[PDB]
Design a protein around this ligand. Structure first.
Ligand SMILES: CNC(=O)N1N=C(c2ccc(N)cc2)c2cc3c(cc2C[C@H]1C)OCO3
Lengths: 85, 339, 94, 50, 94
């Protein structure tokens, strides 16, 4: 993008030079960070990185641990009726 | 080159660019070399321009076509055309194949959380065999833990059965995922963004000792970039290199423990050259571009400016960028990473 | 207590054939599970212009009238012209 | 357009996201690019894990 | 007879530890062996004329002068143009 001035306009070159001054001083990138990231509604959705995990998930293995302790508890329930009979 | 002469002695991106500009303008040209070799510098004491910028102001040249950075101090003496190639401060790191043997990669199939959770089921089932039937009961439960899971009570029968189905899914899952990384290896770091490169001190990073790259972080008022400057200012040993050839040579001999920040044009060019190890990661940090320079009030200023915009619209510039970077590139990593 | 450990005279072929049955099931469970982990290990789709043009499941389009569409039209690059010829003849309208 | 209100005198300067094109460079004066950009890809990132 | 069936308190922990070692090897045998059968599965074998140009392990070229070489030169097709750009600068001379 750019700023436009009429051909042969007085303020043509002064504005052109004034844009290079704002860029090197970092005023343009600072203003870009203002209305985009700072005042943005998803400032948190720009820091978390999603990468390819190497290891195997713990959630799928949880389904096996919840069916094991579910058997250990059911086992101790049958241990008491066999001790009385 | 010794067997050639004239303009056919040289070749490159700007060599083809000069022929296209002259074709739409209709003049003959000659390719000359700058004397001192270092362009775009104005001494603080003498105020005498040198390089290719001084040859236009002093009349020793008519036009200049080369990767010349567009700055404000150069605009007050000569006329700059619109940018023909955009770039910015990027990150260059060696491609980690990994190619990563070790003991931390052995317990990789199962996760760090499953290797430390299976033991909670081990000692949890060996302690039930105490209750369904101490120095000989743990001696027995471990002898009853190895052989799957004297248990005449029905309480102890189903403990060895569910434990059998429980260890079945774990050993099936261990084999399944252990085959998933001898088949495809990503693998897969390291983070491409620049803000992640600053939050750690394991892998060093630096820029050129003198140039536009170091001054960008010095006066930057952005939070992310200021922490990058306070690091390199107090980072020992010297994280700055003398020339650009020393910075690229320092990332190659650092075992992936040193990064170099430079322009994306040079970074993308090194990635496509031998030994094919550097890879540009993440987006650039700032917005800058090259351009063509003409003297103020010259008869070729506006006519050449209107010609570059015609080149970019017809897809000519990107076709030239794809020519001397990726087509004629010696990239052997695109053939070594897929074999 | 005979199921947790695999499976005389007559009871030999009972536990003999039962073991071979539960052999294939625990073999099929391990073989099938390995395939779905290798598929997601492949993906992707990777951030690039060609990976967007190499597949056609996740379709892609631009604006109907604007500088974006005119880019692919007169583009003389191999990767982009392939994207143009795709969207130019893609149905329904992308 | 905004380029029209510059060649026809109804305004003195146009400050906006105005794409620098050749057909516009022939009629008005463009400054240096204060913001670089290019055609990119927007995809809904999964949101696939289940 | 105690080594086939997996693996005193001293010998009981010999039985528990010998299994977790042989359990990983048989899995490291099973998992790695699946990697070499999936490998082949990705043969070509035996591919199309287009995919011959997508890889550089197997080199390809034509005669130094004839109706065949000129075809790839002026072929505006993207596939044959990619083939021509390779053979033109491939070193050594193909
Ligand atoms: C030379 N070896 C090697 O480079 N690796 N080790 C295999 C591996 C193969 C078999 C066994 N038993 C253990 C590791 C591996 C296992 C994984 C994994 C990634 C790998 C690849 C690397 C770390 O991600 C998850 O699991």
């Amino acid at each position: 993008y750019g700023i436009a001035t009429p051909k042969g306009s007085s303020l043509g070159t002064p504005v052109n030079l004034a844009v290079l001054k704002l860029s090197e001083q970092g005023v343009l990138d600072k203003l870009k960070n203002k209305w985009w990231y700072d005042k943005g509604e998803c400032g948190a959705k720009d820091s978390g990185s999603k990468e390819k995990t190497s290891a195997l998930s713990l959630s799928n293995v949880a389904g096996v641990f919840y069916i094991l302790v579910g058997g250990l508890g059911l086992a101790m329930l049958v241990a008491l009726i066999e001790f009385c009979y | 080159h010794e067997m050639l002469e004239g303009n056919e002695r040289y070749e490159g991106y700007c060599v083809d660019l000069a022929a296209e500009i002259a074709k739409h303008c209709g003049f003959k040209y000659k390719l000359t070399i700058v004397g001192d070799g270092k362009y775009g510098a104005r001494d603080a004491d003498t105020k005498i321009w040198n390089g290719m910028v001084g040859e236009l102001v002093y009349g020793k040249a008519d036009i200049a076509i080369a990767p010349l950075t567009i700055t404000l101090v150069r605009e007050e003496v000569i006329d700059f055309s619109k940018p023909f190639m955009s770039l910015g401060i990027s990150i260059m790191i060696k491609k980690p194949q990994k190619s990563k043997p070790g003991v931390f990669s052995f317990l990789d199939p199962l996760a760090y959380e499953i290797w430390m959770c299976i033991v909670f089921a081990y000692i949890g089932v060996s302690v039930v065999l105490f209750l369904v039937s101490i120095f000989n009961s743990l001696w027995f439960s471990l002898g009853a833990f190895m052989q799957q899971g004297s248990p005449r009570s029905l309480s102890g029968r189903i403990v060895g059965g569910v434990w059998w189905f429980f260890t079945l899914i774990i050993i099936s899952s261990y084999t399944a995922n252990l085959a998933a990384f001898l088949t495809v290896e990503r693998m897969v770091s390291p983070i491409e963004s620049a803000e992640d490169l600053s939050k750690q001190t394991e892998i060093a990073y630096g820029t050129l000792d003198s140039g536009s790259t170091k001054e960008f972080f010095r006066r930057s008022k952005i939070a992310v970039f200021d922490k990058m400057w306070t690091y390199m200012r107090s980072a020992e040993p010297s994280v700055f290199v003398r020339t650009t050839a020393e910075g690229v040579a320092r990332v190659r001999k650092s075992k992936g423990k040193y990064a170099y920040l430079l322009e994306s044009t040079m970074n993308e060019y090194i990635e496509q050259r031998k030994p094919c190890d550097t890879m540009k990661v993440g987006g650039n940090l700032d917005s800058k571009g090259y351009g063509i320079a003409t003297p103020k009030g010259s008869s070729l200023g506006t006519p050449v400016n209107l010609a570059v915009l015609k080149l970019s619209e017809q897809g000519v510039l990107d076709k030239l960028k794809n020519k001397w970077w990726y087509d004629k590139g010696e990239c052997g990593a695109k053939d070594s990473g897929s074999k």
